Write a structure and sequence with these properties.
homodimer; about 525 residues; 8-stranded mixed beta sheet; 5-stranded mixed beta sheet; about 20% strand; globular; binds chloride ion; Succinyl-CoA:acetate CoA-transferase (chain A); AcetylCoA_hyd_C_sf (chain A); acetate CoA-transferase activity (chain A)
Amino acid sequence: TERIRNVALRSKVCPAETASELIKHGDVVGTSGFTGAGYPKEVPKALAQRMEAAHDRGEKYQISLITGASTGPQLDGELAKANGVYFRSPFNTDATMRNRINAGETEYFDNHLGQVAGRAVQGNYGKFNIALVEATAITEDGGIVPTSSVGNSQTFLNLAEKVIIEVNEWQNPMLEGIHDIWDGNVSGVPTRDIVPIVRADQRVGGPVLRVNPDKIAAIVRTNDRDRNAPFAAPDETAKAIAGYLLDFFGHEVKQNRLPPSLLPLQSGVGNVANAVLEGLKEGPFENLVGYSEVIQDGMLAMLDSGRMRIASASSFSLSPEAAEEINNRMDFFRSKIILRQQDVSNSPGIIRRLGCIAMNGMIEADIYGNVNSTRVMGSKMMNGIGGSGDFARSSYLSIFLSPSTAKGGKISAIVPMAAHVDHIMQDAQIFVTEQGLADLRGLSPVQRAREIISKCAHPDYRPMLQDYFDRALKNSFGKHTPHLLTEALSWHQRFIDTGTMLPSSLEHHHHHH
Amino acid sequence: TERIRNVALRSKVCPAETASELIKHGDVVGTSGFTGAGYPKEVPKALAQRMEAAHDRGEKYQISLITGASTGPQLDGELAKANGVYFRSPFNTDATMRNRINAGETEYFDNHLGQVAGRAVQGNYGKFNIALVEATAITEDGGIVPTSSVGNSQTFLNLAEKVIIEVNEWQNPMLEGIHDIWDGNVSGVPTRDIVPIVRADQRVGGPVLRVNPDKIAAIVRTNDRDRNAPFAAPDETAKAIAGYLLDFFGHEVKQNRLPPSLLPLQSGVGNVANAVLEGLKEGPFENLVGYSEVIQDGMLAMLDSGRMRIASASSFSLSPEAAEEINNRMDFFRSKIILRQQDVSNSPGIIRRLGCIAMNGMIEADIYGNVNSTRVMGSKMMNGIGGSGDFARSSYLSIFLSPSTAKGGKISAIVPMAAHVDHIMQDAQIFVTEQGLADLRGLSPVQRAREIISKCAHPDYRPMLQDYFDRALKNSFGKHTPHLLTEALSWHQRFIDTGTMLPS
Ligand SMILES: [Cl-]
Ligand SMILES: [Cl-]
Ligand SMILES: [Cl-]
Ligand SMILES: [Cl-]
């Protein structure tokens, strides 16, 4: 059946190559795309080819690329291969784009996801020349039905001088109705509207993105798949982490500090999250609710069983198998899922009101429970802060989960001092590794260190951590948050120099004695 | 006139010593008090005396002390002298207590001020045994009229098993009516209520704290003074900082990025804030609105001149001179000021909705614009994060302001790497020192560094910072946020070793 139900707009249909010509060197381009879902695909591929051709002739051709969050090979990948992006925000997971960022070839700033729309409207990224948005369909009155994510698309459509729509027949038609797009002032000029969400299953808007049809310069018919990353199977480390967390939830319930239905749940993606979702499926809890950035594989089963009653997100983050499950049963799942603008899914006011439980990953934390989510050795970007700050700070409970080591034991995830900080002590209450769980509620920094070192640190590193702390307590400038500035970042430099944080027995180390 | 207007509650009046005996070793005690205003005074003194005697006899006697924010010598001071506090939260500025904290003798955690109530209700500090709250009066129906701050007092009254009220005759009776206490669920069990505030001047509650009178175990008649802010005027450094900020506001308005009346304003206390407020009083922006934590001298002056229409806060921080002024004209100022619960003044949902402009101080920032608000050399507590994070992250514009150096030039306020981080890059858009203003909007870390180093750093330190950055760009593990880990914290260590960040 016809996906473009507004007859007039059919006249704007053209090839991807032609559409890409609308995008000029220097342009600021806002696109759909969040957790590898719903980003434009064919126009960026064509743009990349033309960029490379220009470069080969000594002609400059680069854009500023602002997204919802991560995209995929067709967008971040192709443009990065072409060296076609001078600035990128707010969140990337493509390896080639990451390499451009870490080489300084692409300037990058990872804004809190829930804040991106507001900062865009304030003009922080400049004037938007293009909005490039993937659609499932265009309605009779010209509404744009998003695909597998909402992200920042409404904001980009509002701001952009010209609009290009990719109508993707790969995307299931029955996605129409799953989205909730509000015309309220969430990220516009103050005073903003109250975002009146008081339950995770509440709809406040309608099913379509709105745009003046006169701004639509091109529509491209496509048929291409999202990036449905392979299911990250939980390993025994992930299962141990989930076990400690689930035991903790169980205890909170028995102490009446959580209801038996817990509270609305947010989790980052990865095998730890997968392990947690598997544990919840088998746990004693009931009537669970998701209020998160993403819909993950493990939710589909819980929505199917009835263990989870509703899941709110801005995007899908599904494996190929889960994507197939939801496509064959979209009629059912559409009734169980709400996809929102990311400035709503990640709204601090709503997150706090609902009392979300935030569960996020990390690169490392220091002994005082400051968390690095982004910068390896302090300087090399991984993905970005994403919505981890939106959720950590606003949550009823902020939980960080990670293996206690990385790189086959050569890195400790618990260090004397984080090489970069994304989440301060005040934004992290519970830490979980395969070694155990640290409950830091109501503790001073020194008390936090005692819990993190004892419960979370790996046996290969705990004595080294204890030694640093003990000597810091004796010698630190102040004793409120003891540090030895001469060696605080020395484990990181040891890794840089030698490829491991484990000390050689060929030199003196205080913990060896 | 009689301050205890509920006739029956008069029967609960007793001496401070007797009231202090209600407080036991190990107790969690929640008190009034914020920015040196409205904390209990006489019961803590009596408690401290008894604690010292107990200790001398070999008896343990310590409490957990949870407040709104800072208190004064009668509370933090006396209890610290007595070594009587095992845990303290969320914000202290008393020197004796600070010394206890920095010696490891009192455990301390500086929670975001707007979150303290919610964390207390969740049980993070444990069961509240006592609420000790200063009052201006008790009304005929048993309402508790707060004094010079609201803070967390309503939450502590809700939570505590037993309540002690200090009714202080020193406090102006005309304070009654200035407070706005909401009966809704801001910091209680989820799902919380929507707070219907959509304008800074909107009152949504009543003038009194509510408490079950059966929980009132003692009422103590007191007569003692709050602390005052300094009178001292801002110097040329603070004035230069204010100048850059005011010029910035002007340009924003001209570019239609701010309304002619700006947006609701928040500022921390200090010389720089005073300079900004003084600048605003004689400035071109009319019909200003304050939505802040505190009412300070300059804030008062603008309400007077009409340049500011209304000021919302949780507390007062006034010089003796300004206190005299407001106390002589309370009827007027009462109509211009709203004192709210700190979980409302500091609510991120409200702050973002209103689009506040946040203006905060700092100990230091690094070249990438991460800000340390709290910990000198990374380990020695100054005051605490306070509400700076509540506001910085939620604000329409987050601005940080500071002299570019301290200790007669021996410390640089701009460093290669902050020794402790309270505000991440994402939470700081604008930096101002007496050297100039760095606008970091839309910039990558390397771009941020160029601006901070060139605009904000003192000339004595700028070449050193540029040298660090240039060498980091060449030799850093990654180039997205270049660092040299061997020397990132070396300026701090140099200060520790030699008393200055300047090389020999
Ligand atoms: Cl809201
Ligand atoms: Cl806490
Ligand atoms: Cl609200
Ligand atoms: Cl920005």
